């Protein structure tokens, strides 16, 4: 209807972070004018497009602003993309209470919903993207977060949003470093922080110094991680700066595959707009209005959001499809439009017109690792689901989006050696042992014409031999070596070795009477061996106290990380170790007693035997057993040869004497 020129609050950032959309504003205004032209939907007003230059004159801007507040007519909105002074006015609104209209502020500043009542600005925090990047971390399988940032107040807001997500993430914020100017120090600290999953936040030139520090550290590897976003420019990376000193070649290499992204900053396809314009035709019109260097096109991509907002204002308009009785106070139509804002969401051609919580935009997000620095936007996070179209251009860790905390080491928890020679000689020895046992038994049961009238000592000999065989079974390769059954085996192993040690010194008992014979009935030496067994049982209780042997060992690393918990094995209180030392002391006592003194040849054999026992004492002392996987059981063969000499005595002239 009647194109009543509506006072449209317009000050273009003639100076601004991108003080070129300031022009494109006019172009978007043109678009708006086009809209104002294509007012067919509801021509019931025009725009008194109160046009000014924001011009970054933040204070003086605000001065002129007030002047507008001090001026007619009842105005509409903000010509804003960037905050600071806008943000101020944003805080201010309710007093005048008009349309909070930026578009290019992802500023977490937007979050002051208390203050940010009328909030309306397309740009939104890539933290959701970060959260999508979290998803991407998920797509990376990454769950351990290492990050830092040149602490921009921007990057401050970031750090917040980071923390926001990290909380929402409930994933390991493995590291939270930062920077201000040159954290090359904190870079070394990150080296110290042991880089596996890296991301940081800075500005294209801050980013330049950053990459400088990076090339310096040169810590490039699947450990390193150039996880970033489209805050800087490609050339800002790609192009090099004279102010630098590092290796533009090495640094360039580093730049490849550098993880980053940017949301769908404009209509992806060239479909006829809500204004039936192709995004192609959009760029066309862009060029058309592009009366200056398209190189000098500040807010170029933003101009998309700009004419978008033109159409969006128009959307609210045709929604309302006069009511001018609002003042900076009079709040009836204010609340009306406020509902329209709670109602504000559409499908704009740049993207399904997405109102974030504060009305900010939302759509797919192109996602490009600097794929050979040809950053292949292989993702498109459909903000609806942030559903990253994973175009899978990944030239990455394995070509692959590997996971965070890049470290996975082994552990040499045990070994077996197949017990190959070990179990071999083990079975062989057990065989020969049972053999000699049966042989002596056959020799037994009928004789008296030998040294005395009974080979009762042959019994204690067989007892020691049984101990030998049992320990071959006990500390062999069937409790944590070849056979995999420790959780019970190791548990049961707690007894096994122990039991065998019991019979250890049996045969030596004769010595006592031999000592008595060194002095020169069965009750005497019987009580002697009983006392031996009693000392044994005392130490056995000492061990029952000192229990929990089948224990952990042993610290080491390995050679794709590798560790070596080298041979977790029998290990308990060394108190029982001293107890064993005492047992061996008693043994050495017997040894000297032998050093003092047929039965004499028998004692010489026993002397050789005590020598073997002394040898075994070293293997005991070899408890260090560095190559325990190659150490034990020599003493078993010692015992074998010992019982061998024993039977050698007991055999031939012994038959000749006792039996025949």
């Amino acid at each position: 209807s009647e194109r009543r020129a509506v006072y449209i609050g317009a000050l273009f950032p003639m100076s601004g972070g991108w003080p070129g959309g300031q022009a494109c504003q006019p172009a978007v205004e043109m678009a708006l004018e086009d809209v104002n032209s294509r007012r067919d939907i509801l021509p019931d007003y025009e725009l008194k497009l109160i046009h000014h230059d924001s011009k970054c004159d933040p204070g003086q801007a605000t001065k002129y602003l007030y002047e507008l507040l001090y001026n007619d007519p009842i105005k509409i909105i903000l010509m804003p993309g960037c905050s600071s002074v806008s943000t101020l006015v944003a805080e201010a609104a309710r007093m005048w209470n008009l349309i909070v209209l930026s578009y290019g502020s992802s500023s977490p500043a937007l979050s002051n919903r208390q203050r940010f009542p009328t909030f309306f600005r397309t740009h939104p925090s890539a933290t959701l993207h970060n959260p999508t990047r979290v998803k991407l971390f998920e797509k990376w399988g990454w769950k351990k977060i290492a990050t830092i940032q040149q602490t921009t107040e921007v990057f401050t807001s970031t750090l917040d949003d980071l923390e926001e997500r990290v909380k929402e993430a409930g994933i390991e914020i493995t590291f939270r470093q930062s920077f201000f100017s040159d954290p090359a120090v904190p870079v070394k600290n990150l080296k110290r922080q042991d880089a596996r999953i890296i991301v940081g936040l800075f500005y294209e030139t801050e980013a330049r110094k950053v990459f400088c520090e990076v090339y310096k550290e040169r810590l490039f590897g699947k450990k390193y991680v150039w996880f970033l976003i489209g805050w800087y420019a490609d050339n800002w990376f790609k192009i090099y700066d004279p102010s630098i000193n590092c290796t533009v070649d090495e640094m360039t290499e580093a730049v490849e595959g550098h993880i980053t992204t940017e949301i769908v900053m404009l209509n992806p396809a060239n479909t006829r707009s809500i204004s039936n314009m192709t995004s192609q035709e959009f760029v066309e019109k862009l060029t058309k209005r592009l009366k200056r260097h398209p190189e000098e096109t500040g807010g170029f991509q933003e101009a998309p959001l700009a004419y978008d907002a033109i159409w969006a204002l128009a959307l609210a308009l045709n929604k309302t499809s006069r009511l001018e009785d609002f003042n900076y106070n009079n709040q009836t139509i204010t609340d009306q439009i406020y509902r329209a804002m709670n109602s504000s969401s559409f499908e704009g051609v740049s993207g399904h017109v997405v109102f974030d919580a504060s009305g900010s935009r939302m759509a797919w997000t192109l996602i490009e690792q600097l794929q050979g620095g040809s950053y292949k936007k292989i993702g498109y996070y459909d903000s609806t689901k942030d559903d990253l179209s994973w175009s899978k251009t990944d030239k990455w860790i394995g070509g692959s989006p590997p996971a965070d905390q890049t470290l996975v080491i082994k552990t040499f928890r045990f070994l077996s050696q197949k017990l190959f020679i070990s179990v071999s000689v083990l079975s062989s020895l057990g065989i020969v042992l049972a053999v000699v046992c049966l042989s002596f038994n056959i020799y037994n049961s009928h004789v008296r014409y030998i040294q005395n009238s009974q080979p009762n000592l042959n019994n204690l000999t067989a007892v020691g031999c049984s101990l030998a065989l049992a320990a071959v079974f006990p500390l062999g390769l069937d409790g944590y070596h070849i056979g995999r059954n420790q959780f019970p085996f190791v548990c049961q192993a707690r007894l096994w070795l122990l039991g065998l040690g019991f019979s250890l010194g049996y045969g030596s008992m004769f010595t006592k009477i031999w000592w008595v014979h060194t002095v020169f009935e069965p009750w005497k030496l019987y009580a002697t061996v009983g006392l031996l067994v009693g000392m044994d049982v005392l130490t056995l209780a000492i061990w029952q106290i000192v229990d929990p042997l089948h224990r952990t060992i042993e610290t080491f690393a390995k050679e794709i990380l590798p560790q070596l918990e080298h041979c977790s094995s029998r290990k308990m209180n060394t108190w029982l170790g001293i107890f064993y030392g005492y047992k061996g002391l008693l043994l050495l006592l017997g040894i000297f007693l032998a050093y003092e003194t047929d039965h004499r040849a028998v004692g010489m054999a026993i002397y050789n035997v005590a020598v073997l026992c002394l040898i075994t004492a070293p293997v005991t002392m070899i408890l260090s057993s560095q190559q325990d996987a190659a150490f034990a059981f020599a003493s078993l063969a010692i015992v074998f040869s010992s019982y061998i000499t024993l039977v050698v005595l007991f055999v031939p002239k012994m038959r000749r004497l006792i039996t025949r």
């Binding site: 605000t62 001065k63 507040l69 001090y70 101020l88 007093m95 000297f592």
Partner: protein, 655 residues
């Protein structure tokens, strides 16, 4: 009279917290104004302060600024230092209406925006400079190695920024700079680990709760702490639950805070000739609802000082008139004129504007939990930290320790019981020499062959060697400072054990040949045995000479110290097991011949000495304790010696 529409508007509602008290200082300033009106000094100035208690609502201030412009008349300048938010608003407004002005109140070194604070000014600012007073303290409190933390409120965060600023030219160890948000006890531990000796904090009087809490946790109420803060952290906050209300007051005690020196100490006729005493008298009194808002001194000060720069530019403008609009950029030049001219012997102090900086001093109190000894005020002129002498309520005389303690040395010996020990050792050796001179000098009835034979004087000699070498290496106790660096007392102990094992092997080979004959001249063979002993001895002697047991150990001590002294060799147990084996070599035959059966008790005493050497290893594990242990060891040594002597003394009884 030419009115003076003044930008007399600030957040001053009753709701406005101090803004109420702001009105409480308004009247006073108004009184000052009235005084000035009573003065009628700069007529025809009819001071029409376009006045608006801004009530502190950021948006209220917005609309204020708005009407101030639109409805508001040609007001003058920043009735301010009220609302940091709207302050910043003004900060932006600085050149706004071609604007320029100044508050003077808020310490918010946010004010530091000389970019924005180009077209605006203020005087009473952030007391980061108190560092200099602190430096004065670093002088007076005599510290140079200190750390601090803060509950970094965006202010207190900015405050810590200012602290970093103060760290400029910090020609003293900033021994740390911690910070905090709420993790008091956490940081309390962190900083106890930072060797708690002194403390300064930027935290809320609220945060002060957990502060005092973590304090009483550490409670290191001594030169192992210091309390430093500001009345910014609210007044009476200490006057205002984990810590002992006792320990709470303890924290409040010695609480070293500081704030602005509210007014000139000489309460004399002000720069306005107002007896600053009578000034304040009237201030509180005519104030009649309080004393004016804490800046009361600064409040009426700024009143008269506005007036001061006013008459100043009034001259500078009589140089030229009353028709200034916001367009009057030249009037802004004249403003800058009076601004550079912002300097005079201001009432509260020779108030100039050192880059806008109020020329003043700042009260500094050590609260003894009520004795807020506001002793110090850094006369910014010199920052001359004029301290009320003897107002110090200092726990010790300790001027702030700079993370220091005391080196506690180890070394432990009585040196008298040890003197008595050396005495008795010499006595034993001398009595041995005498009895030997007897036994040889009287060796004519060489009447022992088929027994401990008549040649055992050789064994007595081996024993003499043992006991003397023992006396020496035991007299090697505690003052080796002469060398005390592997001082070759290693060789002392070496010759000691040498003579020892010598005496031992004497009886050893004795019983050897003895039991040998007992089965079924040889002095040469016994000498050979002893020689092979001494041979392995010198071998291991050169061995440990390659090891090369300077007296060094380690311990921390209390009364604060650290102990370190002990002689230990490269063969940590290598030579140890060696000695052990050498000893067992004899002990074996000892027990053996003991079973075989005169000198049996000698072998017994030898085994006793072996147990003694074991106890000596324990003492090596054990101090002066171990010293007396070595003493008792030598005691048992000479004991076995005289025991051996007693066997011979049996013959003297026969003699």
């Amino acid at each position: 009279s030419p009115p003076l529409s003044i930008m007399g508007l600030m957040p001053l509602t009753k709701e406005v917290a101090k803004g109420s008290i702001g009105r409480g200082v308004l009247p006073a300033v108004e009184l000052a104004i009235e005084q000035i009106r009573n003065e009628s000094l700069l007529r025809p100035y009819f001071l029409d302060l376009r006045l608006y208690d801004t009530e502190c609502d950021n948006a209220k201030g917005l609309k204020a600024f708005y009407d101030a412009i639109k409805y508001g008349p040609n007001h003058l300048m920043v009735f301010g230092g009220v609302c940091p938010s709207v302050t910043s608003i003004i900060a932006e407004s600085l050149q706004g209406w071609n604007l320029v002005q100044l508050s003077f109140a808020a310490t918010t070194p946010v004010l530091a925006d000389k970019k924005k604070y180009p077209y605006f000014f203020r005087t009473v600012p952030s007391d980061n400079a108190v560092n200099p007073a602190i430096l004065k303290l670093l002088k007076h409190y005599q510290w140079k190695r200190v750390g601090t933390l803060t509950q970094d409120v965006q202010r207190f965060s900015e405050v810590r920024n200012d602290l970093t600023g103060v760290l400029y030219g910090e020609d003293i160890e900033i021994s740390d700079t911690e910070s905090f948000s709420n993790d008091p006890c956490t940081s309390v531990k962190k900083l106890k680990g930072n060797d708690v000796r002194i403390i300064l904090g930027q935290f809320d009087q609220n945060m002060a709760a957990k502060v005092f809490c973590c304090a009483y946790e550490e409670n290191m109420y001594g030169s192992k702490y210091q309390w430093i803060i500001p009345g910014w952290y609210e007044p009476s906050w200490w006057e205002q639950s984990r810590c002992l209300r006792k320990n709470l007051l303890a924290a409040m005690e010695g609480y070293i805070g500081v704030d602005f020196e509210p007014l000139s100490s000489k309460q004399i006729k002000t720069i306005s000739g107002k007896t600053p005493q009578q000034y304040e008298r009237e201030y509180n009194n005519k104030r009649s609802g309080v004393g004016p808002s804490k800046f009361h001194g600064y409040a009426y000060d700024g009143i008269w000082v506005i007036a001061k720069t006013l008459q100043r530019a009034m001259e500078t403008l009589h140089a030229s008139i009353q028709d200034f609009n916001y367009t009057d950029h030249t009037l802004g030049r004249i403003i800058l004129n009076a601004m550079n001219e912002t300097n005079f012997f201001g009432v509260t102090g020779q108030v100039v504007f050192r880059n806008g900086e109020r020329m003043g001093t700042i009260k500094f109190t050590q609260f003894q939990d009520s004795r807020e000894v506001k002793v110090g005020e850094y006369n910014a002129v010199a920052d001359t930290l004029e301290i009320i002498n003897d107002t110090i309520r200092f726990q010790g005389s300790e001027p702030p320790k700079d993370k220091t303690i005391i080196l506690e040395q180890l070394r432990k010996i009585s040196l008298p019981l040890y003197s008595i020990l050396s005495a008795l050792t010499i006595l034993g050796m001398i009595m041995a020499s005498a009895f030997l001179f007897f036994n040889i000098k009287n060796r004519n009835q060489k009447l022992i062959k088929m027994s401990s034979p008549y040649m055992n004087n050789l064994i007595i000699l081996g024993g003499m060697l043992s006991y003397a070498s023992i006396f020496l290496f035991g007299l090697d106790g505690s003052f080796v400072s002469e060398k005390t660096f592997e001082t070759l007392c290693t060789v002392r102990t070496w010759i000691l054990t040498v003579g020892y094992t010598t005496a031992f092997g004497a009886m050893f080979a004795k019983t050897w040949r003895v039991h040998a004959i007992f089965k079924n001249i040889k002095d040469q063979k016994l000498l050979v045995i002893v020689g092979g002993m001494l041979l392995i001895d010198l071998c291991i002697l050169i061995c440990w000479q390659a090891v090369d047991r300077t007296v060094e150990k380690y311990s921390m001590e209390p009364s604060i110290r650290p102990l370190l002294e002990h002689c230990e060799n490269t063969h940590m147990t290598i030579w140890l097991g060696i000695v052990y084996a050498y000893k067992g070599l004899l002990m074996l035959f000892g027990c053996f011949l003991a079973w075989e059966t005169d000198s049996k008790y000698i072998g017994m005493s030898v085994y006793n000495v072996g147990i003694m050497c074991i106890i000596g290893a324990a003492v090596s594990f054990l101090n002066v304790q171990f010293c007396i242990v070595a003493l008792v060891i030598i005691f048992c040594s000479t004991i076995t010696l005289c025991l051996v002597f007693v066997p011979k003394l049996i013959t003297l009884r026969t003699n």
